[PDB]
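From the methods appendix. Each design record in this collection lists the tokenized structure first, followed by the designed amino acid sequence. Records were kept in a plain field format so they could be parsed without special tools. The example shown here is representative of the layout used throughout.

RECORD:
FOLD TOKENS (184 positions):
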């Protein structure tokens, strides 16, 4: 429920897991661009599809979305313990892309693999940093079960919905999370 900028979307790829601000940055921008293209690709790369259901879906998603603030506090030490509940989001999104990745086309699979890898990378670095700095705990992903559970379907064009939803949310949550941690 709030328009957000897009900023650059290209910056080549990294060279190795340095676990530095540069490594994470490049991995975020790369994975972000790939996800976006892969998302719209489902609609034959139709710019219309990208902004087709982007009028109500933005405010009708079952998954969580960031929308608190762009900072903790300059002074006063009010409402301590800021920035959290990120492992769950990244966990679900990762399980979604990786889940559908197994059942995809040649191209979709090729790109899907890279998407998952990047996600796990940023998740490992972020989780590690927050793990060393502070604590953290998480139960376990259950959405996977529901998805795999299916509900009357085989090879129809209805899955494009659920997939498009999880994809849109994932990407959005990614860019947002980055901007939040970047404070710029």
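DESIGN:
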């Amino acid at each position: 429920s709030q328009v957000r900028r897009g900023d650059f979307t290209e910056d080549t790829t990294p060279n190795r897991p340095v676990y530095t601000t540069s490594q994470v940055g490049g991995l975020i921008t790369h994975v972000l661009w790939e996800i976006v293209e892969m998302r719209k690709e489902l609609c034959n790369g139709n710019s219309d599809c990208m902004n087709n259901d982007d009028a109500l879906a933005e405010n009708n998603l079952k998954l969580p979305e960031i929308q608190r603030n762009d900072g903790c506090y300059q002074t006063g030490y009010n409402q301590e313990i800021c920035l959290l509940k990120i492992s769950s989001g990244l966990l679900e999104y990762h399980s979604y892309l990786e889940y559908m990745k197994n059942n995809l086309k040649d191209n979709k699979k090729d790109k899907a693999r890279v998407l998952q890898r990047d996600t796990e990378t940023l998740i490992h670095i972020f989780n590690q940093e927050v793990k060393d700095l502070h604590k953290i705990v998480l139960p376990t992903p259950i959405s996977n079960a529901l998805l795999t559970d299916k509900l009357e379907s085989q090879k129809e064009w209805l899955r494009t919905k659920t997939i498009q939803f999880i994809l849109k949310s994932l990407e959005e949550f990614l860019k947002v999370t980055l901007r939040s941690t970047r404070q710029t």
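APPENDIX NOTE: Residues 106-133 form the longest helix (28 residues).
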